[PDB]
Amino acid sequence: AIHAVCVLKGDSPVTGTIHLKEEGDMVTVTGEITGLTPGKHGFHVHEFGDNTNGCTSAGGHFNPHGKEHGAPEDENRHAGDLGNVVAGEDGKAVINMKDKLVKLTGPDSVIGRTLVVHVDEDDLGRGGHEQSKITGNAGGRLACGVIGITK
């Protein structure tokens, strides 16, 4: 089973380590993000593992299948759409999810792409804003990291 890791850093006090592994026929995503305002923050795989311009150079959500932005539970979602992380009152969010569209092998592999955590909540495509079906209207990028191969 392939194992990957991602260390989050950006123009904010937000930090965290995310681990990804193949488990059965899905990918299991786990970790903790700290330094967040309490509540929901958008969390996605973005297309490029490019940190030449902070988190901005990561580009948009990873979307190899040409879908609209949605919830993890939807069929019409970007491959990179992992919904929201929920920070407690102490500013810390813990992830423990299994996803069928995130891949660590094959044409839709996310190795070498980016994870991003956002300023605002991801509205799952349903907020009625111009960016809802593009980004979930999740606002700016607090921290990001390139997804790398680990032991």
Next chain:
Amino acid sequence: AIHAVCVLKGDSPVTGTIHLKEEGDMVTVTGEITGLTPGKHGFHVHEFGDNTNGCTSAGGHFNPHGKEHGAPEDENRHAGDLGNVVAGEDGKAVINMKDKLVKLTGPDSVIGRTLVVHVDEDDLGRGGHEQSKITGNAGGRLACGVIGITK
């Protein structure tokens, strides 16, 4: 043609951006590294794209073929062995090389692995030190980055 990028940072003032692309049947590696002492510094692909423990968690040189450490020109070399970068008196090194063992596709892809620049010169396996045939005796790690997919 696949394009990748790597942004170097570590426990030093050493920074830089490295671009990698498929070109013909090799990979072309270009970029600038700054903040270096003048002279030669080892420069390699390491196995893991893991920044959880600075540059140390990148592990050893990428070595899918089970060879000893060598020069880029050698057959008996690690896939990740890119030799030395040469910093001028101004502390800046520029890279422009083509390599046949670095890959951006297939089983020996370096997407999601790490580039590292070192404190010392890489002796190309020929220095007669215990680590020469392991690391080139290149010493500690000034800066590193995960190799990510770019446009």
